Amino acid sequence: KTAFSNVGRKISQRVIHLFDEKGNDLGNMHRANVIRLMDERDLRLVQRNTSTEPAEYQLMTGLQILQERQRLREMEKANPKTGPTLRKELILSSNIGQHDLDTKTKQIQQWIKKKHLVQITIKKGKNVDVSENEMEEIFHQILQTMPGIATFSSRPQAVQGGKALMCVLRALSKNEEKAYKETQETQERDT
RNA sequence: ACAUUUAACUAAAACCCCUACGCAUUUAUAUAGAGGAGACAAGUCGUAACAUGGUAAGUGUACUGGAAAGUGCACUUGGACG
Numbered sequence: 001k002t003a004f005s006n007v008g009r010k011i012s013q014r015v016i017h018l019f020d021e022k023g024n025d026l027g028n029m030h031r032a033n034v035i036r037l038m039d040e041r042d043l044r045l046v047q048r049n050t051s052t053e054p055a056e057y058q059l060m061t062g063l064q065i066l067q068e069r070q071r072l073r074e075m076e077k078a079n080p081k082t083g084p085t086l087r088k089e090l091i092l093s094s095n096i097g098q099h100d101l102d103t104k105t106k107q108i109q110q111w112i113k114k115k116h117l118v119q120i121t122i123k124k125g126k127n128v129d130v131s132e133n134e135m136e137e138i139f140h141q142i143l144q145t146m147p148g149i150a151t152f153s154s155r156p157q158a159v160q161g162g163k164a165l166m167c168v169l170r171a172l173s174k175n176e177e178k179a180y181k182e183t184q185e186t187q188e189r190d191t
Numbered sequence: 192a193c194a195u196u197u198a199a200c201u202a203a204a205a206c207c208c209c210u211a212c213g214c215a216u217u218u219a220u221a222u223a224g225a226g227g228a229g230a231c232a233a234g235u236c237g238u239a240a241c242a243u244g245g246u247a248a249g250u251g252u253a254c255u256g257g258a259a260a261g262u263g264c265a266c267u268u269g270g271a272c273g
């Protein structure tokens with residue numbers, strides 16, 4: 001995380017683009033001169049933008065730093081963007097039992113309702129040789145439990161020289177979900 | 192409930208009842224279906240225990256969880272400890 005707080009007296013860079021407490025642009029200056037300003041005016045230094053090639057810092061009072069920090073947290077509460085997508089993964093075997101596959105299927109379902117990405121790998125079993133098409137059946141069994149709740153993010157693909165298949169499942173987009181409801185309703189009208 | 196009559200110059204003859212057992216009660220077997228234990232065997236998913244077993248283990252109790260188990264409270268050492 002990046003916090004809106006006083007950077008301190010030790011500034012990372014040597015050349016610093018500085019602004020005034022009122023926003024007046026003071027231009028670029030050396031960090032040694034900035035520390036002298038912070039002491040002469042009794043002000044603290046915050047980092048407003050780092051993307052700019054010349055590092056941009058602004059002088060601010062403790063009261064201002066508080067108001068901005070309060071402002072920002074009122075925006076994020078109003079607009080809490082879910083930034084990270086978490087890639088959960090399950091390595092399965094071809095000879096997995098039904099009780100174990102039913103347990104791992106329920107686990108996959110809970111990951112999809114949380115809007116995660118589920119990478120499913122299926123590997124050849126111990127003492128067992130299987131047709132690569134048979135391994136692909138498990139993917140369709142897992143997804144069949146989630147008819148209108150999930151779909152192939154990446155379709156089944158052979159990996160490790162064909163020894164083990166791979167896949168990625170995802171939650172259906174809102175548009176794809178309304179389409180499924182529509183198609184399902186049309187079938188209801190037909191029947 | 193039943194009630195002793197005839198007979199008696201030797202003495203004997205009459206005497207003969209009916210109510211229970213069932214839709215009760217006792218015990219057991221058979222049968223729809225649902226579970227447990229053990230044996231064989233070692234497939235499936237984890238690695239809970241045994242080493243400080245990789246979060247020391249366990250007792251009681253509570254809650255929770257695919258599963259061993261996890262966590263809380265007290266207790267035990269059948270653990271450790273300048």
Ligand SMILES: [K+]
Nearest residue numbers: 239240246248
């Ligand atoms: K344990």
Ligand SMILES: [K+]
Nearest residue numbers: 243247248270
């Ligand atoms: K132990």
Ligand SMILES: [K+]
Nearest residue numbers: 249250251252
């Ligand atoms: K206990």
Ligand SMILES: [Mg+2]
Nearest residue numbers: 086087088089
């Ligand atoms: Mg990861």
Ligand SMILES: [Mg+2]
Nearest residue numbers: 238239240244
């Ligand atoms: Mg263990």
Ligand SMILES: [Mg+2]
Nearest residue numbers: 244245246247
């Ligand atoms: Mg342990």
Ligand SMILES: [Mg+2]
Nearest residue numbers: 248249250262
């Ligand atoms: Mg305990």
Ligand SMILES: [Mg+2]
Nearest residue numbers: 255256261262
């Ligand atoms: Mg818990």
